[PDB]
Amino acid sequence: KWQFTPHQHRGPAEQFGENDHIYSPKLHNGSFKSRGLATFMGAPYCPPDRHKIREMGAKICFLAVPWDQGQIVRAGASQGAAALRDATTQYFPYMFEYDVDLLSFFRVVDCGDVPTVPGNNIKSQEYTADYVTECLEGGAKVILFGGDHSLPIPGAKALSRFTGSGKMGYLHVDCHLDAAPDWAGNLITNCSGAPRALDLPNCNARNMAHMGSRNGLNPKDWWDFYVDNEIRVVTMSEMIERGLEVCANEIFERVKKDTDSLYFTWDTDSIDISCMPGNSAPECYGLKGREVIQLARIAGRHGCDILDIVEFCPYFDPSQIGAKMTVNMIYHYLGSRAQTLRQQGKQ
Amino acid sequence: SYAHLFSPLGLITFLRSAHVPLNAEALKACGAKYAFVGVPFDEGNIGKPGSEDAPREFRLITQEYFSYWFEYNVDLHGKAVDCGDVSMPKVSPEVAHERIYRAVREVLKSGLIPIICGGDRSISITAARALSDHIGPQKKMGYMHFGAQLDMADSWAGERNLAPCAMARITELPNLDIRNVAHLGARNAMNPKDHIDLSKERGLQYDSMFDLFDAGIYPLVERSIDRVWSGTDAQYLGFNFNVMDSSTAPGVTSTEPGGLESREMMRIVDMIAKRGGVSVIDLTELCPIFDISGTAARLAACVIMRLMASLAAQDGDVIDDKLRRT
Amino acid sequence: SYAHLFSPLGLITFLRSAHVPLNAEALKACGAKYAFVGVPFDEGNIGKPGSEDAPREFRLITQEYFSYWFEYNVDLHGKAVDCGDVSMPKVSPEVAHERIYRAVREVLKSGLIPIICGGDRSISITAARALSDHIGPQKKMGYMHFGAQLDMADSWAGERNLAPCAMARITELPNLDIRNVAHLGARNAMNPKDHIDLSKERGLQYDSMFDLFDAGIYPLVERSIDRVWSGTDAQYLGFNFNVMDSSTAPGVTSTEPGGLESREMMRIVDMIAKRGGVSVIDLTELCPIFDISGTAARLAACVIMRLMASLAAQDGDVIDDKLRRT
Ligand code: NI
Ligand code: NI
Helix, strand or coil, X not given: CCCCCXXXXXXXXCCCCCCHHHCCCCCCCCCCCCCCCCCHHHCCECCCCHHHHHHHCCCEXXXXXXXXXXXXXXXXXXXXXXXXXXXXXXXXXXXXXXXXXXXHHHCEXXXXXXXXXXXXXXXXXXXXXXXXXXXXXXXXXXXEECCCCCCHHHXXXXXXXXXXXXXXXXXXXXXXXXXXXXXXXXXXXXXXXXXXXXHCCCEEEEEEEEECCCCCCCCHHHHHHHHHHCCEEECHHHHHHHCHHHHHHHHHHHHHCCCCEEEEEEEHHHECHHHCCCECCCCCCCECHHHHHHHHHHHHHHCCCEEEEECECHHHCCXXXXXXXXXXXXXXXXXXXXXXXXXXXXX | CCHHHCCCCCCCCHHHCCECCCCHHHHHHCCCCEEEEECCCCXXXXXXXXXXXXXXXXXXXXXXXXXXXXXXXXXXXXXEEEEEEXXXXXXXXXXXXXXXXXXXXXXXXXXXXXXXXXXXXXXHHHHHHHHHHHHCCCCCEEEEEECCCCXXXXXXXXXXXXXXXXXXXXXXXXXXXXXXXXXXXXXCCCCCHHHHHHHHHHCCCCECHHHHHHCCCHHHHHHHHHHHHCCCCEEEXXXXXXXXXXXXXXXXXXXXXXXXXXXXXXXXXXXXXXXXXXXXXXXXXXXXXXXHHHHHHHHHHHHHHHHHHHHHHHCCCCCCCCCCCC | CCHHHCCCCXXXXXXXXXXXXXXXXXXXXXXXXXEEEECCCCCCCCCCCCHHHHHHHHHXXXXXXXXXXXXXXXXXXCCEXXXXXXXXXXXXXXXXXXXXXXXXXHHHHCCCEEEEECXXXXXXXXXXXXXXXXXXXXXXXXXXXXXXXXXXXXXXXXXXXXXXXXXXXXXXXXXXXXXXXXXXXCCCCCCCHHHHHHHHHHCCCCECHHHHHHCCCHHHHHHHHHHHHCCCCEEEEEEEHHHECCCCCCCECCCCCCCECHHHHHHHHHHHHCCCCCCEEEEECECHHHCCCCHHHHHHHHHHHHHHHHHHHHCCCCCCCCCCCC
């Protein structure tokens, strides 16, 4: 049921070794040059169905939500997932920096993509919500790869419902504040993630936070939302003055305090344009490469129930840098999470 | 009305700003503090071609931004107008420079701060002269410039008004004491031996990129800001964005590794704005042809707009923060 | 003749170098210290294609620079020659490698420092083996490689001389003590467990990027330089510019986020130059198809040219200060 082939290829030169996936390939070059039929991390494919998930004992579901028509800027994010999956072939599922085999530690599965209904934000978001719900209810934590930054609306709703009478935090890392009460009357575009979360019955201001804002594509109402609701914003200025680590640990403490679950949405435009040109609206004065990897390490020490990464557009990138940066956001989060769990004596 | 500050309910100009002819009286009435002037002139350039399309490409990038800057609680609406482009004639440099000169004199008589988007670095020679002539010999000018290249060729290919000569000409101006001149970024090998010799001979205390890194950048920048603004009646500020690291501004005529990061320049901008005024702002050598994602142009745009926003905040020209969409 | 030091009066080769054939006698006599050697060899690459075009593309970027580096007061003119590309069949790597071997031996017979530009990381195996054999079993060699990947596959797909085996083969060299081996920059997940295990079994004391950050970088680099150059008679220095942050090195076979930035690698080069000598400089796995406006190739170029310059500075092979133009 939870099965995959180390280094992908079946047929006469199949490898069968149970640990072959964390070692140099033996019979051939695996997927390192030619992608073939690669799933995320070479993980087994598993339908986003709570029975199948639960039967495989999967603890991490990778689920792509490519929807990019909830967006007030420009389409392209729908091509992200495919470049992500390709970039994972350039890596092993083993991380020497944490001494962890990500794949076997988490029994990670690739849940494929969430279907879309073109031109129908409302129905596509219900699909996403349903799909996430199956992953949570199958007993797994979730990686969601966008797609538009409309993604935390159905994502936070899925987690809110599943959390029940518990309490949920919401962390938002981004170049933009994304707190339009509405955008030309629309409540559910990619620039209203934070207000929509605050609307959820078990998500409270005190367990919400934003990081990474700078420059001037933040209308005053998006700022005013944070001020009026007393939600911790850490600008890019403060992150640089006080240190990434200090700020990060502080807000992770704030969003985890007396919460059962955490929703963490991470917009790739939080990353400096030099490192992430392939973006829906890329901005300078952002995280450096080493900082992205450090923030992902920190997030993994703390843990979240859903990590979403959004707004990656490979069409606007000549190289592999964007896709590989995005692999690293995930892989360092998972590696760090595994290292932390192992030292605590746990999953 | 402040509807533009907030989320909506339901020509090609710098910042979507109103146009106003290149005319001292019109500009004095128009209400703004800055006048954008494109100068698509390429014919000082000996390196790679492209600078002549930067004014358009720079204008276009600036369209994508909101006027409100939450970091400073400033709105830029109505702070700039766009005077269009200076009318470049046909392979006639001397007459081209004469036209730019007059353009700059015009804007300066209005009171407003020209933002001069090149085009090649040599346009600075004549813009700086214009400021020089405007203020006259009873006043004192200061000059600050960011670049990887000193541009201190007494003459180049047997010519004297080409981009690589620019500082050599600028440092001859009679009311610009060398002690009020700064140059920040010089690195790598587009700096031949005579540019140094001449700098030593005239007392130009350029701050090379690695002098800056060794001093932690900001302390040495602060001293150089001081030399330029303290005691002077007018200040010229110019940017060649090859002062930045290659990865941060690929779209420039002569990109160089080992330069400033974007966050270092945002802090330097605030240091400049603390002095509460500047007379001319120029940018040259943007070269959009070799830049997908328009990384360099986006960086330039953020540097200029942040400078505008930061000067305003220093001036107390903020918006009332109690205001709400509702 | 010194006009090349100064602003102008008015065969693609490395640095616009003279071609010298690849003959020990011709090279002995040509007066240069370095011989560039293109190795457009591709067939040890296990990942994406394109490194075959790197030697051409590297050469072009180097042509745009002047030879005089003001920061070191050094002129590179005539310090290098280009011997062209090593002639190699395709679909016959054994023979390909023996041709690389012979090439590198020749250059070392001349007393010139070969600068080897790949092509894939496996060329370093042969190149390093050359240097080993060249100095003999009576003498001690040292090795320093920068890169994100350890390349310590004992085998890969049943094969022994591919790129990801590079370091596994290099550390079996009779006269290279694992104590004189340094590897700096390893990070992220292209580093399978068997590469860790073999590193630990052999006492490879690699400086992971994380180690480097924890140490503030330069101190750990200093200790690694010391081990490579102390009590050794010859030192091989190799670069995979995926040691660099993706942003500064997109155009490589296997880019990697979270690595060195340009100014850091430039600090490192000066620290290497203090030791006053190198026997072999290699760079591999540039990959122009993936570059963004030549960022990576231009970084590689500045690194190799600053190192030459910095070595010359440490040798006191500088230019007479009291030299002026025309
Ligand atoms: Ni967003
Ligand atoms: Ni955003």
